[model samples]
Target: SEYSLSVAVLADSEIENVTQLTSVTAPTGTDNENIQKLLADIKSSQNTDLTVNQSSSYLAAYKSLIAGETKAIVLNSVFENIIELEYPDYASKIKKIYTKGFTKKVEAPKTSKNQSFNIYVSGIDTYGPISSVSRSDVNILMTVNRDTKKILLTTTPRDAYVPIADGGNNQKDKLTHAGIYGVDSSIHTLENLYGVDINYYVRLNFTSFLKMIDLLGGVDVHNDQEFSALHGKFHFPVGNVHLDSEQALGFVRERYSLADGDRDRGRNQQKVIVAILQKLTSTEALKNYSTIINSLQDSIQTNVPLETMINLVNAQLESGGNYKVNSQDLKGTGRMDLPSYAMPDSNLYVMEIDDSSLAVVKAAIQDVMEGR
Candidate 1:
């Protein structure tokens, strides 16, 4: 509700800031969705290829551009001053060639217990110091209805190709890529795809996520099958396997070894989450309420304040025992992309969601909203 981000392009040659980037060059190996958007925004008569200069070394690249080694580069606009400061005669030599300002629109007030609401759970890839955007690996839409007392979790794969909110028509990005724009964009993307109101959000960084599991007295999760995890250090038996704070992280993050990859990982996440919820609501669990919320407060970022959290629980109590939880797994046709995720502008290796799966999610939200 308060600020905006200014994204712009800078040239290394004779090009002005706003000049069309018909065939621009940018850093490779970095998941910069804005760079993709930058190319999309630049309209020109002649089609051009985005030449990828494989490097994450910002300083070297900048220095290379100054020496006329590279073509051009992009910046956060806020960083222009630093660039200018480094190059003393900045105005005379270097200049911004293109720019765009974006501010989040007015959001609806928080949804209440008297109605249904959607809470988006964003799991960012990075651990510790969770500020700003990154690739979100886990995206789950938790829909709760006061009347129905049912909480539905709809999980979408991180690489699922979908239209980004406000990212212009024909500009499709991975569902997980929405985090690059901030949580609001992620929420809006889901709201647009599912046709529902996303009233609240709860985002957890990896460290926070690990801390949460430890506070839950360590969850008891059932393994779908006998598996050797932790590089074969820990054995997950085919039955109920108890998880500690550390073990839980291994369970959720283990995608490389699974047969189904992210799909199995999604199911594992669901089971562990449900298990945690059950532990929290258990008779022996209510006594540890204060400790539970205390840990949670420090472990997550949310739009739902403390008092409102109480209201949510209170509303459910009023409609007690009528509640149930459901899952609307978004099945996608995971496929290869022209450029891979994380390292966009490369080879295939990303999940691709089909159009019908989106329709399924839309109907599921509608079904719960309409008391189906």
Candidate 2:
């Protein structure tokens, strides 16, 4: 229900004209309850003192600004991008005075090693743009239990027909398609499916993926069987392997040509992830923390605060014991012609999870979370 947003003003307008704003307009409805607070923060950021009018109709609100009824408007990037694209002439005329972090008051405490929590790691569809909304191709539920110094990483197939969390309706959406709605949708869908409270999330795109591999000095992935590259650029061995950025990208994307299809790919994704984490936690890798963090800001999105990360790392060192990791998979029937509630199409390929298998994985997750 909450999202990050920015303020958009006339690029040519000065602070004085910005201060002279008579009204403000923003989208209204269930998703936009923060409209009033959104407007207030914009004015405060610009130091403008004025009685701003709010409009629920998007067209009317946008037009009110276009008609000069208001000096400026605030919009979510996705919403604002469309207007700027349709009216290029007006685009240059707009400038954001400042950007403010969006916050919704909540009573949840910060994550601590004392309490086990779960996080959803979603990789969006695009390769270069992290902000572009697209299918969540990579869905992994990571559960951490500090009490037992154990971590569990479970991969969920993207094609699972699961119910959405905050998607206006409870329709079954292809797990990947949830990202098209929003990360929250994907998170909520998984939340309902797994029946777990997802305390945090880590989102990334190909841009981050490539950068992460390079920053980790590349990773060593274990391959069970040798396979030819899907792109025919290289061949992989059956045992220990090392990959650069380009090679690593191909490794994760080479599922289609494999005999087992996505199942093989899912396990491969976990291999790379575990390898990356291993490198990241090493004493030598910690030395490059500054560089890695700087590069990841735009490439990754997460709810975990920086302080929490530091604390978690510190706790790991204090624990002075190896953290046991368990990787699990959720298997489903092969893809078949199916109708997707999220797609609403005649013939779409989707996979249905076997409830028994899901139930088994669910129990494992619960056991780890409870330190059993």
Candidate 3:
């Protein structure tokens, strides 16, 4: 009943904001019709019933808001940027709701039940449209050992030259393109590339990264870097220090500050992951499970069924924090020169992977599945 009540309140919040949206001219040289359709879809899918009024400019939307035309407004973060820069006054009045639809509990169906299942984890860049085609900056393959109470994280570099699944015309492309076709395609791509089965996926935007960190009451992380480029001149000592969402994002995104390029960045991200998990298992987080659940409800997109979550939660509770986690990086060896994709003014050059690295990954996966 509490879950249903929360959902109802969220839906009502979305509906109340719809009246604030007013009709305005669509952006130039863009998909005006599709944009409007997306807004309509979002409005219809809300937990409450309300009509969405479209507006091309924030000023128009702000006017409606000031006139008490709507209780809230929904705009992509990219558009929100322009509003913040152009109308600081209006920006200060509004707060982000940061909510997501589509929540399901995953369970292994009886017909296709298995002791283990693979989940694909994707990290998208922050600059583009939330729905736009962007490369997966970080790709990790995770397999859960249901019987042994073990979790394995296998990291895949973005530039790995693999045959992109669902990619048209391009026989061979970077692994990240799988995301452009949506999460299903990304999972299919990984399965085909690695010759493994991935039954579930969790798609996370940059916002999710920030919110999860904040929800955990900030993570305690040890950074090798004396100074970070993204977090201004802030330097993290080798010892662990608490990090808020913005600081945590900066820690994960600091490639330039690291000596080994993105590889080191990958390691830092993994460290952050481990830190978050440690925090989640602590007494503080356990006592505030509702806050964590609500934060996840707003931030995460997963195909894992609702039943699976219930079972997993029960398993975690039963295990009493005695669980093993294995971390692996999917190693590759190759070199490629591609034009600037996400970043302009530069060509992408990737280093190759060694044989020993690949061996390490394969062995790790086998060991986890066999309960080693």
Candidate 4:
């Protein structure tokens, strides 16, 4: 959400540099002067009515969206606020929008000159401090190719049997718990699981999730089947539909309604993410750039510095059109009786990866990055 705002300001003739204006404030000011100014400019130039709630924190921005204070908001992946704020009739109004390209000047360890570095894209399932460990529901190992503008997304189910780093117990635990030990622990666990060197991570929670989605004016997705909601029996129809923040959450989190269970739900969640990326690059998203940028303030949390984000936006912009996006799932077969107590007590199934699938996935990553 913040990145979209920065890019919009950079592109606008009236606004010289969005980063320059907002960069000086160590913590973004809540006074709402800059936001008001931006809103006024948009209204004057674009003839649109935009109201930004100055009193809202990045975390509360979603509530603002829910209350109709603004059309959208950006949030981290871990904020459990969404879990409590479920309103069946109103949930369908929200959706998640995934960013389409990598930021320029990708950060890596100092020794990354000769070798590729691994980054753990972890979605923490909590609020409070970024360093505090929480459930990493969405854990993906991302490999970036500096030589070519390509990247790979390798997802690890949170329930996978894995040893915790900084050893407390040898018992199988939810992979997401690795963040609790620390980022290093999270990275180490991933490295051990995948046998790849992981040195960096981008951790997000629920707050960031809402902010990004609102910025994109929600995302459009195609539901494969009809389903009911937990809070209410809100039936989501099968076919193409536009979703807001709540709807997106319900869609991604709804596994019980399907016969295939959580694994199928995982694929659906990835599909929703991909859909958001596609929508963000559309003409409609470009038109609403200012609204999206203004919503980023309290919504996102990442170790990524503002300057690197700017550089990345510049690179993505320069790449122009004709760039393609590809999505892949690390192959695995369903298994019953996973030897873990923490796992849900149903059939106790999990994804078991084979060597062939791992090799194919690795080659695909190499090919995508090298433009092969």
Cα error, residue 64 of model 1, in Å, equals 10
Which number leads on TM-score? 2
- Cα miss at 222, model 2 (Å)? 1.3
Please give the distance, in angstroms, between residue 60's alpha carbon in candidate 3 and its true position after superposition.
39
lDDT of each: 0.65, 0.72, 0.59, 0.53
For model 4, the superposed segments whose C-alpha errors exceed 4 Å read 1-119, 127-133, 143-151, 167-172, 197-200, 231-234, 279-299, 331-356
Model 4 Cα lDDT, one tens digit per residue, 1-372: 111211121111233432222211110234243344444554565565543334333334544555654444433232222222233233244543211121224334323443344566777776554444456777776665644545566776766656656321334555665665445556777666666666566676766666677667788878888776656645678899887876776676677768666666766666766676566556555455445546664544455445644544555455545224355666566567665323323355455665686677667755654456
Question: Residue by residue across 121-238, what tens digits does model 3's lDDT show?
Answer: 7887764334544557878887777788788888777776555553212245566655654565567767775667777777777887877777777888777656565647556667
Q: What TM-score does prediction 1 earn?
A: 0.70
| Model 2 agreement with the true structure over 150-175: per-residue lDDT tens digits | 88999998988777665424666568
Off by over 4 Å in 1: 1-74, 77-109, 112-114, 166-170, 283-291, 315-322, 339-344
Question: Residue-pair clashes per candidate, as listed?
Answer: 5, 4, 17, 35
RMSD of 1: 9.0
* Pairs with steric clashes in candidate 1: 16-97, 17-96, 17-97, 17-98, 18-97
> Best lDDT goes to which candidate?
2
Report the C-alpha displacement of residue 124, candidate 2, in angstroms. Answer: 1.3
Q: What TM-score do all the candidates reach, one by one?
A: 0.70, 0.71, 0.62, 0.56
Model 2 quality (TM-score): 0.71
Error of 1 at 276 (Å): 1.9
- Could you give the candidate ranking by lDDT, starting with the highest? 2, 1, 3, 4
